[PDB]
């Protein structure tokens, strides 16, 4: 980009296509075929109560609709401990490789526990990977503010996040 942008046959299409924005778009077409699932696996009670939540994430690799499962705040607050952190990050993994599904994560970022704030930031990292040269919703916009907050857990999720997304 700059060679292409100097010629200016079209500015936008070339930037998008050099950038990873077109790689986000082709996948959207693909998902429909492979079939969008709300499928979860994992069992209740004890340390599996933590697992089942996380596992929904891993099973919904790449960009997938699992919007309605996520929309329940029940499952998220039902996780315990440090496991709460991993839950919010894994919601980002449902929405891996794509901006769309930011909104659910932002909610966690403001509310309750220090634990879920760190989780929200890590997950926003995982999701925003589908950009680095589209420069459409930069990672930097979200991620600056939490470096400044001196709490160690919050900052750590966030400055690792920057590393992944760009």
């Amino acid at each position: 980009n700059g060679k292409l942008s100097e010629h200016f046959l079209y500015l936008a299409k070339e930037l998008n296509l050099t950038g990873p924005k077109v790689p986000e778009d082709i996948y959207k077409s693909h998902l429909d075929n492979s079939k969008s699932v709300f499928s979860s696996a994992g069992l209740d009670s004890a340390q599996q109560n933590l697992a089942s939540s996380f596992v929904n994430g891993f099973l919904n690799l790449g960009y997938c609709n699992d919007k309605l499962i996520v929309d329940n705040d029940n499952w998220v607050y039902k996780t315990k401990g440090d496991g709460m952190t991993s839950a919010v990050a894994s919601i980002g993994s449902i929405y891996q490789w794509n901006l769309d599904g930011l909104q659910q994560l932002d909610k966690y970022l403001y509310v309750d526990e220090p634990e879920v704030k760190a989780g929200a930031l890590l997950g926003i990292g995982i999701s925003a990977s589908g950009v680095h040269d589209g420069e459409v919703e930069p990672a930097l916009l979200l991620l600056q503010d939490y470096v400044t907050n001196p709490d160690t857990k919050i900052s750590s999720a966030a400055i690792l996040g920057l590393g992944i997304a760009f």
């Binding site: 069992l43 209740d44 009670s45 004890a46 340390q47 109560n49 039902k78 315990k80």
Partner: protein, 395 residues
């Protein structure tokens, strides 16, 4: 209730262990023992060893409470044994390590224990083991002479397995044909008598003692009758019962059948719950749900037993079995012909599942089946019954 466990051994007390677990598993017997306090005293002052007999009973209390406990495989039989030596010189006998006691005949121990409970409780303990017989005494050569006893009775029935036998069942028949001779020829010669007993009144609890220890004359050794026997799980005694007594028993048995089915109906519904996981309750092992269910079951079973007993006619007398069927609850088996240092093993039918049995090889617990006990060939090839303990159905 709570599962039975290891019974502390310490060498040469094998026989002693086996008999004690055996008595415990009888439901009635356990409670009376638990409910024994020295305040109620001996119910007979006909015995100069009245105080000692109280003391035994108390040490068995100790043992029983601890046996039940899943925690304690200790029961401390060190003191109990000491007490036995004082009470009876049979048990002071036989040189050994530490005290003098060693391995013995579980048959000897069982008769002596029996009197101990009998004196403390009185006639209540007794009626629950009294067997009446209408005994006909006919000389084989003089059949014409027939002398009849109607008030003959005994606490214990002998199964003779000497003479042609292949089964416990056959041996119960041969056991009625004891043979005795009589110096009088006013009863017709010095010939053997056929002595034929029919049981005209059953006790709640039936004790079978194998008679089989003898000195084999020809080899000049202690021996025991080597002949095969096989003991079926379910016993039926309908043939030995005099017809007139038998009819009443078949009718009673039917009310009992109904309860046995409602007991096994709600039993199945237990197994399902455990099979499934615990689902949501959140950061919990399944184990905590599960223990609770195990507790329900033990309660439900005692409750079902009480239903059989309440439903029995008020015509039924205490010290009569309701029925003609009995269920096998305890097998004291013996191994080795010598009992001078033979070894005793114990099989005890599991409480929580009657279906299952625990083999208690002294302290050491291993799981076996009810079937495994049926499949025994008996004799000396395998462990073989010396004392069998039989429990009236539903008690």
């Amino acid at each position: 209730a709570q599962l039975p466990v290891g019974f502390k051994n310490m060498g040469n007390t094998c026989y002693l262990n086996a008999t004690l677990q055996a008595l415990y598993r009888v439901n009635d017997l356990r409670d009376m023992i638990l409910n024994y306090n020295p305040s109620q005293g001996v119910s007979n002052s006909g015995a100069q060893d009245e105080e000692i007999h109280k003391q035994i009973v108390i040490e068995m209390k100790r043992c029983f409470e601890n046996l039940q406990n899943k925690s304690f495989k200790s029961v401390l039989p060190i003191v109990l044994l000491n007490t036995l030596r004082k009470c009876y010189p049979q048990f002071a006998e036989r040189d050994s390590q530490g005290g003098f006691y060693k391995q013995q005949d579980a048959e000897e121990l069982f008769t002596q224990l029996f009197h101990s409970m009998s004196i403390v409780f009185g006639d209540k303990f007794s009626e629950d083991f009294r067997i009446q017989f209408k005994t006909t005494i006919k000389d084989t050569a003089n059949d014409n002479d027939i002398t009849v006893k109607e008030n003959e009775s005994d606490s214990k029935l002998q199964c003779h397995i000497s003479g042609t036998t292949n089964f416990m069942r056959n041996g119960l028949l041969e056991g009625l044909n004891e043979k005795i001779e009589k110096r009088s020829d006013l009863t017709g010669a010095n010939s053997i008598y056929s002595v034929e007993k029919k049981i005209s009144r059953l006790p709640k609890f039936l004790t079978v003692q194998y008679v089989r220890f003898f000195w084999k004359r020809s080899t000049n050794k202690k021996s025991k009758i080597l002949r095969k026997v096989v003991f079926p799980f379910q016993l039926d005694v309908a043939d030995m019962l005099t017809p007139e007594y038998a009819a009443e028993k078949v009718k009673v048995r039917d009310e009992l059948r109904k309860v046995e089915k409602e007991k096994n109906e709600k039993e199945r519904e237990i197994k399902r719950r455990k099979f499934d996981p615990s689902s949501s309750e959140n950061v919990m092992t399944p184990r905590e749900q599960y223990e609770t269910q195990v507790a329900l079951n033990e309660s439900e079973k005692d409750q079902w037993l009480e239903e059989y007993k309440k439903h029995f006619p008020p015509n039924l007398e205490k010290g009569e079995n309701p029925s003609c069927v009995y269920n096998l609850i305890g097998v004291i088996t013996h191994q080795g012909a010598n009992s001078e240092s033979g070894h005793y093993q114990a099989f005890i039918r599991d409480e929580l599942d009657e279906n299952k049995w625990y083999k208690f090889n002294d302290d050491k617990v291993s799981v076996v089946e009810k079937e495994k006990i049926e499949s025994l060939a008996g004799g000396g090839e395998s462990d073989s019954a010396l004392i069998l303990m039989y429990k009236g159905f539903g008690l």
